[PDB]
Amino acid sequence: SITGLTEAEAKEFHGIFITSFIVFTVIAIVAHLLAWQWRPWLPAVTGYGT
Amino acid sequence: SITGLTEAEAKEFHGIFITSFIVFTVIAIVAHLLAWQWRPWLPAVTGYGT
Amino acid sequence: MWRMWLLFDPRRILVALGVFLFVLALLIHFILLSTDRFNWLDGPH
C-alpha cells in the first residue's frame, strides 16, 4: 500500500465514493432535464426556428 | 523493476487499464455516432449544401 | 477499480476533484451566461 491504506478502509472509501458519485450524477441528470425544458440546445442546421 | 512493481500486479494493472480504455473508447464512439447524426462534418468541396 | 485508492491518496483526490469540478461548473455557467440564448438573468436581446 504505497498510499498507506489497508484493504478494509480502501473498500470503505470506494463504496462511499461511488455512492457520492452516483448521487451527484443523478441530481445533475435531473438538472439537465429541467434545463432542456427551459431552453433546448443542439439546434438544427437551419437554427432553432422558435 | 525500475518502477518497483511485481509481475503479478503489473498484469492486474494492464487488465484494468485496457478494460477502462475499451469502455472509454466505446462511449466515445457512440458519442461520435450521435454527433455525426446531429451535424455531419467532412463536407464536399462545394460545401455541405443543406 | 477500488485498487486505485491504494495507488492514489483519497485525500489528494477529493480536494483536486472538488477544485476541478467547481472550476468546470464555473466555466460552463460563465459560457452560458455570455450567450444570447442561455442567459437566464437579462434574457435574449
Binding site: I22, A28, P40, W41 | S20, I27, A31, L34 | -
Partner: peptide
C-alpha cells in the same frame, strides 16, 4: 436531439460504476 446529451452524460457515469464492481 436530447439523446445526444443523455449518452455523453449518463453512459460515462454507468461506466465508472461498472468498472468499479470488478
Amino acid at each position: 436531439m436530447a439523446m445526444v446529451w443523455m449518452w455523453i452524460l449518463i453512459a460515462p457515469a454507468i461506466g465508472i460504476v461498472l468498472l468499479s464492481r470488478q
